[PDB]
Design an enzyme around this catalytic site. Structure first.
Site, PDB file in Angstrom:
ATOM      1  CE  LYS A  70       2.510  -0.963  -5.156  1.00 15.96           C
ATOM      2  NZ  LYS A  70       3.974  -0.993  -5.504  1.00 15.96           N
ATOM      3  CB  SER A 256      -0.358  -0.412   1.138  1.00 15.87           C
ATOM      4  OG  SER A 256      -1.575  -0.752   0.523  1.00 15.87           O
TER       5      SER A 256
END
Ligand SMILES: [Fe+3]
Length: 317
Positions: A70, A256
């Site tokens: 991610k 993230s």
């Protein structure tokens, strides 16, 4: 602390250590290095907090954004000029002048690709050639259909065990033949272009600037032309009218959640000021030495542009 940069090779780590000593000397924001082996090892390390950042090609930006990594893009590399800048580049198909074949006539030919799963060297050309591919798969892999289509290729990083014809034209020695690193001489944009110039392949899938950066002589540059999507051949300077796709730049990725985005940004922004294009005689951020090309960041880049908040890896792409 410091921003930890992930390096995917030994010469890249060497440049990172030089960037770290240059920032200290100039009293800028601190950077520190990490050495991994591939881009996926650096994607794994950033995800597991061992590194904070790395610059990636569009196809790995996709991969790094997936679960469970991610990662998201934070700064895009700027190309072009100061006067005409852009955060995109172009996937082209380069061949030798004199030939008669077109984009639709590539069956049985010999190809040079920058690497497996790279954007202009792979995803773009395999996405374009898809109608001639005759892919019955899955469960048959995409590489198996490509191996049947071209007579022999050089696609760095492809499995020579399962697909022997995709590494067949590769120029590396021993276990480094078909390697996804600088030890395979046909790796990346310049390596794929050199595979075309050497005469091992009839077509090289690269970006628009490789020929201008590699051939400084204009007359030497006139021995190549592009293969356009209207099935016409056109000269190398007509890339804006003859390309396979317009692709976004290579980008720095971070996590993230708690990725140090602003710390990464301030590092890059400060590094571009002090050590940018013609900024210093001591250190060149957008430059590689001797037998190396594109160490950390692309050699022809002139800056960075901050990728906006909540922009996905899929939405940046
Ligand atoms: Fe690329």
């Amino acid at each position: 602390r410091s921003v930890q940069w992930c390096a995917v090779s030994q010469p890249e780590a060497t440049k990172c250590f030089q960037w770290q000593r240059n920032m200290r000397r100039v009293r800028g924001p601190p950077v520190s290095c990490i050495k991994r082996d591939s881009p996926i090892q650096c994607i794994q390390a950033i995800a597991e907090n061992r590194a904070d950042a790395v610059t990636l090609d569009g196809g790995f930006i996709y991969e790094a954004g997936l679960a469970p990594y991610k990662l998201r893009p934070v700064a895009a590399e700027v190309y072009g000029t100061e006067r005409q800048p852009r955060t995109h580049y172009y996937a082209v198909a380069v061949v030798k002048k004199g030939g008669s074949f077109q984009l639709n006539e590539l069956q049985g030919l010999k190809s040079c690709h920058t690497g497996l799963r790279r954007t202009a060297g792979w995803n773009v050309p395999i996405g374009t050639l898809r109608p001639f591919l005759n892919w019955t798969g899955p469960p048959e892999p995409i590489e198996a259909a490509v191996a049947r289509f071209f007579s022999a290729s050089c696609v760095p990083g492809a499995d020579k065990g399962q697909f022997p014809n995709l590494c067949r034209l590769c120029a590396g020695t021993g276990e480094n033949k078909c390697a996804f690193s600088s030890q395979e001489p046909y790796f990346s944009y310049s390596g794929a272009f050199k595979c075309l110039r050497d005469g091992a392949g009839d077509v090289a899938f690269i970006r628009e600037s490789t020929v201008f950066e590699d051939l400084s002589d204009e007359a030497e540059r006139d021995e190549y032309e592009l293969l356009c999507p209207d099935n016409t051949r056109k000269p190398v300077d007509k890339f804006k009218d003859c390309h396979l796709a317009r692709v976004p730049s290579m980008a720095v990725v971070a996590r993230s959640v708690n990725g140090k985005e602003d710390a990464i940004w301030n590092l890059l922004r400060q590094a571009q000021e002090k050590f940018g294009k013609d900024k210093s005689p001591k250190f060149q951020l957008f430059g590689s030495p001797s037998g190396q090309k594109d160490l950390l960041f692309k050699d022809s880049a002139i800056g960075f542009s901050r990728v906006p908040p909540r922009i996905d890896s899929g939405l940046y792409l």
